[PDB]
Amino acid sequence: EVETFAFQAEIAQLMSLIINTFYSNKEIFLRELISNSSDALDKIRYESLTDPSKLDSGKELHINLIPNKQDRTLTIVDTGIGMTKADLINNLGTIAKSGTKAFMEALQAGADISMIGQFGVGFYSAYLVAEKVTVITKHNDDEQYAWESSAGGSFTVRTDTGEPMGRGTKVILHLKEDQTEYLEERRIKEIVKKHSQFIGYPITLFVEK
Numbered sequence: 001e002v003e004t005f006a007f008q009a010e011i012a013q014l015m016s017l018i019i020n021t022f023y024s025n026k027e028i029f030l031r032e033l034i035s036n037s038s039d040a041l042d043k044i045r046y047e048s049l050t051d052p053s054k055l056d057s058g059k060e061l062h063i064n065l066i067p068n069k070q071d072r073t074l075t076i077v078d079t080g081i082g083m084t085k086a087d088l089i090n091n092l093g094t095i096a097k098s099g100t101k102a103f104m105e106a107l108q109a110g111a112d113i114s115m116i117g118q119f120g121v122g123f124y125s126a127y128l129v130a131e132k133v134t135v136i137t138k139h140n141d142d143e144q145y146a147w148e149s150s151a152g153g154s155f156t157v158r159t160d161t162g163e164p165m166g167r168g169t170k171v172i173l174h175l176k177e178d179q180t181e182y183l184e185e186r187r188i189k190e191i192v193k194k195h196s197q198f199i200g201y202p203i204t205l206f207v208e209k
């Protein structure tokens with residue numbers, strides 16, 4: 001049972017700008033997604049300070065980067081607070097409408113796409129490199145859900161029958177054909193060292209057969 005939703009017009013505009021603007025510095029997508037994971041881990045850590053049972057769904061707080069060249073996917077896994085179904089539908093827990101408004105004003109006023117994270121909509125930088133994005137998520141207060149979009153104005157939400165996650169969020173980037181450098185170990189290491197050196201959680205880059 002799959003529910004299909006329309007993006008708000010402002011978010012559809014944001015994604016089309018990200019997909020269509022000529023902008024070579026695409027590597028910042030990974031910084032933005034790792035930053036989102038760190039924010040989600042901060043949230044469940046804070047909640048656990050007054051209620052230790054919040055970590056009954058998993059005590060480890062970490063970020064995993066999983067490249068798969070056969071599937072041409074890069075997956076970013078975190079054990080943060082996750083998202084409810086309502087969060088997913090509401091622009092994956094962001095204030096994307098007001099954030100997009102501020103971002104596009106800054107772009108005409110000198111800014112570039114790399115500053116997207118300052119406007120709270122860094123998730124959508126995934127479409128710099130991905131033709132399709134799948135988000136699997138589990139929040140303590142809801143069931144496991146799968147969000148998916150290839151842009152084009154719509155996204156889907158369904159209950160996830162796949163591998164149970166415990167708690168957190170999995171962002172699966174189905175990479176564009178010409179963006180497979182982001183599956184190479186040395187390229188991922190370079191980006192993480194350049195942009196994510198002070199993230200306060202272990203980042204593990206998985207290797208392949």
Ligand SMILES: Brc1ccc(CN2CCCNCC2)cc1
Nearest residue numbers: 189192196197199201202203205
């Ligand atoms: Br790939 C990769 C590259 C470098 C690190 C070093 N890290 C920085 C991120 C946060 N943990 C402290 C140490 C990790 C993964």
